[PDB]
Amino acid sequence: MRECISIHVGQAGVQIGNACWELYCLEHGIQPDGQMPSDKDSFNTFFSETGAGKHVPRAVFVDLEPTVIDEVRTGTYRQLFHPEQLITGKEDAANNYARGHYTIGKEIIDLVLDRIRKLADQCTGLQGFLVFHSFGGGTGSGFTSLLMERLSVDYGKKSKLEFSIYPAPQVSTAVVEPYNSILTTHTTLEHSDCAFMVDNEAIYDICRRNLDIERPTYTNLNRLISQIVSSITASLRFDGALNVDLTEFQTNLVPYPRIHFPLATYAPVISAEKAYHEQLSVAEITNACFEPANQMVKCDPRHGKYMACCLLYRGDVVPKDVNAAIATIKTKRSIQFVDWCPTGFKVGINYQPPTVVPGGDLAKVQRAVCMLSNTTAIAEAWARLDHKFDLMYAKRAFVHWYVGEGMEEGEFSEAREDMAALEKDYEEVGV
Amino acid sequence: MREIVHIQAGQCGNQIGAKFWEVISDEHGIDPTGSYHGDSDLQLERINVYYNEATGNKYVPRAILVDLEPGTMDSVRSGPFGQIFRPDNFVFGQSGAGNNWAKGHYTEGAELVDSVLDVVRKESESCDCLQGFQLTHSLGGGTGSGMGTLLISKIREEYPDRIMNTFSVMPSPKVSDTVVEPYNATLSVHQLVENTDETYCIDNEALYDICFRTLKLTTPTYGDLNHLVSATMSGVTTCLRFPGQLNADLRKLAVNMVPFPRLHFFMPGFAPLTSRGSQQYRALTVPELTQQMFDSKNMMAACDPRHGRYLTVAAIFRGRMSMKEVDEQMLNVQNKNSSYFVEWIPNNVKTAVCDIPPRGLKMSATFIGNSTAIQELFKRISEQFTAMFRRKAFLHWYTGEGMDEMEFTEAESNMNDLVSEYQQYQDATAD
Amino acid sequence: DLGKKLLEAARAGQDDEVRILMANGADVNATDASGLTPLHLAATYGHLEIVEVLLKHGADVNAIDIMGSTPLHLAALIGHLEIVEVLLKHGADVNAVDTWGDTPLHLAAIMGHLEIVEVLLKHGADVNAQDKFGKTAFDISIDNGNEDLAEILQK
């Protein structure tokens, strides 16, 4: 196999990673103590093995404050991870990109690399890293951008994928979150090969609409996010022919290195209270992949053009029914590919139904689908973020907090200007 | 970000500071001897923020008591909680200040400032991870104004990376008709704009108007005024003392409330307004708490928010209530009063909910606002300062202690520049 | 020069020294470098007994300094109610104007001396008197939001 190391930065990256690794164990059949009964490899990309038969995740948890990681050190899966891979500081970045990148982040950046090096030396064929972090947090933005620069120097030919959390005012914690999201994007744009953005507002509205959760919490959001991250990384952990390694993620989803932000859509999402629902067909869940309500980022792909589209099915799915669903969707919907790409749809099928976590809000389904697509409509997400950035930066609001922590004010302009060039990268492709 | 060192200086500082410890000790379930008598684990979650753990099950406040007059030392020990304060933390000089800002800042207080710093270092080094300092004082007197600002400068140059917070009491002729108080207040504000991170303006003019016109108290006393202060200080520190989100620490609060370094003077609000032992307010709901929190009659500073524009707003709700209802009411006021919020700071309103309400109440709401309307307080003190300074009245009291006459002019020029800075962003548009 | 000693004696409130200096021919209407008379300093520092004995010995109750300040201006500013009633009893100009356009009513309204405001109004203080910036005593109450001062000026 080719191993994969997952990196979890900040509160958002740690709590989402905790929910993901709980789901990974229930999918592979791994007990919370790391023991897996005589199962019959592919799962070894995410799990190493000790001499006693213990399956330990290839994961690193980093945070500048210990409150969130201390929950993992005492939680249900506390005996699953290596204790030395749970790294904690004492004072967080205070929602300041400059603290996580320049001042506070430097005091622990070397220790994180030496711990990552220990997992790297254990691998026989390391292919890349998975980085989980938020955009708004000082650690998720400042420390992540710092870590991505170091990984490009010490690991030259290794891939790097991101699971980034897009800020949403419903469940946001800082007014300077638009600042940090722009600063971390400009500094990580050249060091990241493919980034899957998760809009908190999209996941928030899905929980209220489909799951009937009046006021969703971080628990409700993370369980749904982990259910989507699993469908994206299932091809790396199980047998298949589509997106079998990190290099294939770039080949299938990213035609040009700067536009490496694919859009993810998931279906079906059904509340657990409706255990006796009707099993939606392959054609029903495929048509739901083109509705804006099921997308992980709030945007309208009908207003953009397609450069790539992948379909990862899970469960009772007959391949002949997928082709009939694509032929109908090709002629029914207004799906416009760019003039320089083949209008084909890549299909991968895993014949196991998705695994639900006990205590979750999702019901069991016989078939589910996750579509990964690269459409120019995702530039709308950058446009809303750039508008909040320009409103505050015109008056230089909150800027003194950043320049007081080693950062220079000129970095604000070079980052915003890079976003303007990134916005025109989508316009030059699909007008 | 955990422990906070408390410091109280002067007559007003020790009076409002003693009431602060009496109120929060009843909320955490601490008797006058220091033994925990509560019945909730949340009372001991964040108790290390304001208390030090003694030998037994005793919690000692992290408070430092300073004053030039020895008389107030006897008044603190006469209080119900005078024995829980550390006898090592009592620093009292020989002669008072005599309502002279120069005696506390240059002569009498400059000799006593070294003995306090030794207590600050002894208290700060015993903290596992010091967060900052909070100071309670008045600005119209001599010690809390003169030595209070001197102690801030001496402590800040030794702890520059920490947070300096102040609860400053503004003078008013309605309560104390001492004509040299506009002198001491203006000289203090000249220091607060440079040496503090967060300053809560507790205006005696507003406290008097609330007791006289709303509470129907024809002869308001300091006990009636401090009842509003202690209730406000307990509310603004709710999330520093309980398992909370929103800010949770002083720096994250400062990043989300201070858009410009000089504009760090907050307008406290509170609702409902009850007398001492009256227990009158009862049928108070969520829509009414949100209404009164943004009303001029519930502001602890004599400033009408309708006259200016909000830069940042933080609200802390206390009691058993609906998170969905609090969110619907906060969004409604932001839409109803959208003309009173600046449009170039998106999502400038932070909302908080705490399940533990204060003593004698089930519903409570504390308002922390950074409004441009606070200039009406600074223009009121400046007008009284200019009326006195243009006649050179009692100027020999200050020059006789070593002050130069230019210190009054440069202090008069700073607050006028501060008022022009509030009016600057009050008229600014996003365009 | 007994004029300089009478100035300092009126400041420190030495009643015995003021009576003796006047007995030796001291100028009751002497002025300092800024034009302050012994009646100015006695009314500023709240020495009522010295204000009384000065007015009975040829003191000019309406004297002005370099900046046009009368004894009534400084008494209304510092807030000496008993001195204000004594000065008005000896013919002090209730509507005297200094170099800033301020009247005794302006200074009492600004400093919050509410009882002195009522006394000045009862003695004929001009409510329409504007300062150098057009503000009257009623304008200062509105701009500062002083409702008790506003109602006093409305009678």
Ligand SMILES: Nc1nc2c(ncn2[C@@H]2O[C@H](COP(=O)(O)OP(=O)(O)OP(=O)(O)O)[C@@H](O)[C@H]2O)c(=O)[nH]1
């Ligand atoms: N979906 C999801 N989002 C989260 C979670 N925790 C935090 N966030 C988001 O992350 C953003 C803030 O970043 P954080 O991760 O909390 O901050 P941090 O990475 O710990 O960095 P610091 O500023 O130093 O605390 C907010 O917009 C939150 O909405 C979580 O558990 N799940």
Ligand SMILES: Nc1nc2c(ncn2[C@@H]2O[C@H](COP(=O)(O)OP(=O)(O)O)[C@@H](O)[C@H]2O)c(=O)[nH]1
């Ligand atoms: N709200 C309130 N204000 C006070 C109290 N005591 C004094 N003050 C105010 O503080 C000012 C006097 O300053 P003070 O603190 O007594 O002088 P210091 O001892 O040199 O600090 C006056 O304007 C009072 O209005 C009090 O208990 N409560």
Ligand SMILES: [Mg+2]
């Ligand atoms: Mg953090």
